[PDB]
C-alpha cells in the first residue's frame, strides 16, 4: 500500500539520453534512480514508508509542561498550578511541530501527576489518597486566585478529578484554533501599527490550565508534580521547513545564537581509515 518503488533491471547504454545531466537552477529536484546511471538487477522492493507518515510521526505523547504545587500553606509555596497552554517550552516536541508552518489535528492529552513528602525530622503521617483537580480555562474565563477560589466550581469549564494510584487521567480535544489551521510561525504583529507582540504569542491563545489538591490540608508539607503530555491525532500539516539548527532560547520568539552549520573535521578529503589488519 505505502510500498516503495522497485528497481527495474537496466543494461548497457549508449544514447543521447541524459538522465544524469540536469539543471538545479530550475528549482527541480532530479528524479534519477540507480537504474538510470548503471546496470541494475530487478528487485521487488517490499519496504514501506508506513512509519514516515505525518500521522505516525507526530502521533506520540510528548511532554509539554511540568510544574510543582504544595499541599500546606507554608512560606511562599504555590498550592496550585497555573499554565498558559502552548508547546514552546519543551524543545523536543516543539522542534517536530516546527518542521511545518501550519498544523491541523485533534489531540489526546494525558497527565502524569506524582506526589511526595518533603524531608523532615518528625514527619510521621497517615494521609489518605490525594485527589487532584485539573481545570481548563479558555480565554476570558474567571481565574482562581487560591486553592479555595469559587472558580474551582467548574460550572462549565472542563475539569478532571483524579485520585493517585489510578491510571493517569486522559481526554481528547478537537481542533480549537479559530483559524483553519494552527500556526507554528507568524511573521507578523498583534497590532496594525506593526508593534506589540511579534510571532506565535501574537495570535495563539489556547487558554490556561490550573491544577490543585482537592484535599483540605496535610499534616506536614507535601508537593505534587504534574506533567502534561500532548499526542496529536487525525493530523494535517502544510508548508514544510528547515529544522531548528540553533538551540531554543526563549519560548515566546525564535531568538537564537549564531550556530555552526554542522560539526567540523580535518579536511574536505578526510575519511577515517577503519581497515587496519
Amino acid at each position: 500500500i505505502a510500498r516503495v518503488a522497485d528497481t527495474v533491471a537496466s543494461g548497457p547504454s549508449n544514447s543521447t539520453s541524459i538522465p544524469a545531466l540536469t539543471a538545479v537552477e530550475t528549482g527541480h529536484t532530479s528524479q534519477v534512480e540507480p537504474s538510470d546511471t548503471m546496470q541494475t538487477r530487478h528487485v521487488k522492493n517490499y519496504h514501506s514508508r508506513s512509519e514516515s507518515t505525518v500521522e505516525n510521526f507526530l502521533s506520540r505523547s510528548a511532554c509539554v509542561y511540568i510544574e510543582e504545587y504544595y499541599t500546606k500553606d507554608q512560606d511562599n509555596v504555590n498550592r496550585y498550578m497555573s499554565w498558559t497552554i502552548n508547546a514552546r517550552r519543551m524543545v523536543q516536541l516543539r522542534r517536530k511541530f516546527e518542521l511545518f508552518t501550519y498544523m491541523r489535528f485533534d489531540m489526546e492529552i494525558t497527565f502524569v501527576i506524582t506526589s511526595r513528602q518533603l524531608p523532615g525530622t518528625s514527619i510521621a503521617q497517615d494521609m489518605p489518597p490525594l485527589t487532584h483537580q485539573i481545570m481548563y480555562i479558555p480565554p476570558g474565563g474567571p481565574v482562581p486566585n487560591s486553592v479555595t477560589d469559587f472558580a474551582w466550581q467548574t460550572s462549565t469549564n472542563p475539569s478532571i478529578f483524579w485520585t493517585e494510584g489510578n491510571a493517569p487521567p486522559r481526554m481528547s480535544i478537537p481542533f480549537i484554533s479559530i483559524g483553519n489551521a494552527y500556526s507554528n510561525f507568524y511573521d507578523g504583529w498583534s497590532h496594525f501599527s506593526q508593534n506589540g507582540v511579534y510571532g506565535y504569542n501574537a495570535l495563539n491563545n489556547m487558554g490556561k490550565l490550573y491544577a490543585r489538591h482537592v484535599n483540605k490540608d496535610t499534616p506536614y508539607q507535601m508537593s505534587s508534580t504534574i506533567r502534561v503530555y500532548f499526542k496529536p491525532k487525525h493530523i494535517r500539516v502544510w508548508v514544510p521547513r528547515p529544522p531548528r539548527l540553533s538551540p531554543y532560547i526563549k519560548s515566546s520568539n525564535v531568538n537564537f545564537n549564531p550556530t555552526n552549520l554542522t560539526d567540523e573535521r580535518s579536511s574536505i578529503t578526510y575519511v577515517p581509515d577503519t581497515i587496519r589488519p
Binding site: 540536469t22 538545479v24 532530479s30 534519477v32 517550552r89 539548527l245
Partner: protein
C-alpha cells in the same frame, strides 16, 4: 456484570499507544477545513528534496557559506583528491544536517539510494571533466584515481547542463542500515577526482565553486522512530 479479567499492562500509560478517549469539549464545531498549498503526507516527501551539502565543513567555515564551497582550480592537479567523505546520511557530519539527514535522525533505520547532485558555478567559459566515484565498504579509501575508478563512478562533463547526478545505489548486505551507522553497517565512501582538468580562457577566474546537493530516491525509507540528538535543554524555556 460481565465477568472480566484484567491483563498485565492495565492502567499503564505508553506514549505510543492508541486508544479512544472521551472528549473534554462535546459537540465542538471544528473550524471549516481550508485547502492550504503544500501539504505534507509523508516525511519522505521532504527527504527527497535536494538540499545544499556542507562538504567543506572545516572548523574555519562552520559558520560561513564556504562550508558549501567545493573549489576546483585550473592547472595540473592529477592524482589530487578534490574531496571525499563517508556514506552516513545521518551520522556523517557532511550529511548529518541536510534536509535528508536531518529527518533520518528521527529514525534509527534507513534504506534506499541517494542522489548527489553536483552543480558547477564557474563561468560559462570554464570547461572540465570530473570523476565522481563511490566505493562500497570492504577496502581502503581510494588513494589514486585508478583505485576510485574501479568503483561505481560517474564522469561529469561540464557544459550547458550545469548539474550532474551521481546516484549512490543501495548496495548493502542487510535490507536496512542504522542511521547511527557502525562499521558493521558501513556504506562506503565517495571520492571526487579530476578526469581531465579545468581549462579556462584569458581574463577568467581560475578557481570555481561546485555546490553539492543530497536527497533520497523513490526507493528510500526510514523505519525506527526515535528522538533527534540535535536538540535539548537544561530547563523550561521562558
Amino acid at each position: 456484570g460481565l465477568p472480566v479479567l484484567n491483563t498485565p499492562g492495565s492502567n499503564q500509560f505508553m506514549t505510543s499507544d492508541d486508544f479512544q478517549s472521551p472528549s473534554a469539549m462535546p459537540q465542538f464545531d471544528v473550524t471549516p477545513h481550508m485547502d492550504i498549498p503544500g501539504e505534507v503526507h509523508n516525511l519522505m516527501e521532504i527527504a527527497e528534496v535536494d538540499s545544499v551539502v556542507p562538504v567543506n565543513n572545516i572548523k574555519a567555515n562552520l559558520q560561513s557559506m564556504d562550508a558549501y564551497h567545493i573549489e576546483v582550480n585550473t592547472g595540473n592537479y592529477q592524482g589530487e583528491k578534490i574531496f571525499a567523505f563517508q556514506m552516513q546520511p545521518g551520522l556523517e557530519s557532511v550529511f548529518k544536517r541536510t534536509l535528508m539527514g536531518e529527518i533520518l535522525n528521527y529514525y534509527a533505520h534507513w534504506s534506499g539510494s541517494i542522489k548527489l547532485t553536483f552543480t558547477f558555478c564557474g563561468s560559462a567559459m570554464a570547461t572540465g571533466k570530473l570523476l565522481l566515484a563511490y566505493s562500497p565498504p570492504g577496502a581502503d579509501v581510494p588513494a589514486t584515481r585508478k583505485q576510485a575508478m574501479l568503483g561505481t563512478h560517474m564522469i561529469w562533463d561540464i557544459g550547458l547542463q550545469s548539474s550532474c547526478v551521481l546516484c549512490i545505489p543501495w548496495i548493502s548486505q542487510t535490507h536496512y542500515r542504522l542511521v547511527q551507522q557502525d562499521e558493521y553497517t558501513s556504506a562506503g565512501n565517495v571520492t571526487c577526482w579530476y578526469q581531465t582538468g579545468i581549462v579556462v580562457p584569458p581574463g577568467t577566474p581560475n578557481k570555481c565553486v561546485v555546490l553539492c546537493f543530497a536527497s533520497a530516491c523513490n526507493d528510500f525509507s526510514v523505519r525506527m522512530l526515535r528522538d533527534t540528538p540535535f536538540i535539548g535543554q537544561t530547563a523550561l524555556l521562558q
